[PDB]
Amino acid sequence: TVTDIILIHGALNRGACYDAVVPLLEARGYRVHAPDLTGHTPGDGGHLSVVDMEHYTRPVADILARAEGQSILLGHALGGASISWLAQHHPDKVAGLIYLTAVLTAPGVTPETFVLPGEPNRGTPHALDLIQPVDEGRGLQADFSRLERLREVFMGDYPGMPPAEHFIQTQSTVPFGTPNPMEGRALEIPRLYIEALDDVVLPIAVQRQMQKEFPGPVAVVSLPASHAPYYSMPERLAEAIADFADAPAEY
Template sequence: MSTYVLIHGGLGGAWCWDKVVPLLEERGHRVVAPDLPGHGRDTTPVSEVTMEAYVNCVCNVLDAQPEPVILVGHSMGGAIITQAAEYRPDRIKTLVYLAAFLPQNGEFTGGIDDTESLLRPNVVMSDDGSYITFRDEILKEACYADCSDEDVARAKSLMCPQATLPNITPVVTTEANFGRVPRVYITTLRDRALSPYVQKQMYTALPCRVISMDTSHSPMFSTPGELVDILVSL
């Protein structure tokens, strides 16, 4: 039995893992999928959502587990698990990046250029600059191209505004801490949110064991069984 901690991405919540959690539990594993601050059922105001708040949330979850965990981050969640690994390397058995940002020391998600992403040109910024959303009409093609209409509608109904500050906050990592945690990158070959080209740039710069899925950005919706097969094989 392993313990999996599943960290959602931008605009998301623990609900992103609703198909994955029961499949992992059916195989006898422990699963924790928290809502990050300002997401899902968490009521933190968007003005108070920072990278530090995200990482503290994850570290608190890690500290509460009886054993080192398999820590999975989707999309923006990759930056969060990267920083958490710097602070808690001994609490993590394996880092898993699922269609995720994998920033190097000093990088931040908003500074990783992806000219093939459909999200970047469709950002809608709040008047005060504190949060972003995306144009509704591109969300399916960008993030959920191979997902059912029902899953897309549910995701849209549960999405929340994404605080901008975490996306402009650099990660600070060292080889002595983050660098010693084993890394796996699950690359999504039909991704229009975080392009396979940029995914490859990141997992080449910080080498990982690489596993490919022929999916869009959200295999936890479209192919949860295949994703769980991969996770339990790690």
């Protein structure tokens, strides 16, 4: 029943960031997607172009529409906020949810609740520190005065640096404010959390707090990884992805 797997980029990234993995999941027989979200394609308008989440996530919904059977939505970092939103609006069309060191918020809880300082086990002080407001506050951009610091925190995973086709310049604050609207059939959908144990953007302590705070069971797999599992262990990540799309409920 599960024909398609859809990989979804986090803040200030692009679908290309997944290139190490797309062939590995194609091998296991799926149709593999790594779209760019609205405002994440150079020359598509940029961060200000994105009205809301329905508009931010439309490129995936388009795919989900064209799927032949079921689909699996993976999200990375802020990408978790998207697959949660889509799950509620296409629960017929998606058969499982992967949150790859991603933001998973209980219904009604926004992603900033965990990005911002809070108790208990909430916030990402490294990420707020290297990501600054721009455009009178309606976009976020990295802090290029500290490039090596940017690499240590976000690109540590890359062997050796990541290519330019992986990132964008400024990110819309739309997914940050919009709460998780999941309900009903949406919550039936199986859930798995791949957590990067060595992530210091989104620290393991915050990763578990979200699983705990989320109503209902979340299956869990654990990668000894930095911020990006895909860069440093595409195989290990690809396997645990394709084992989940083989049988999401049992897994």
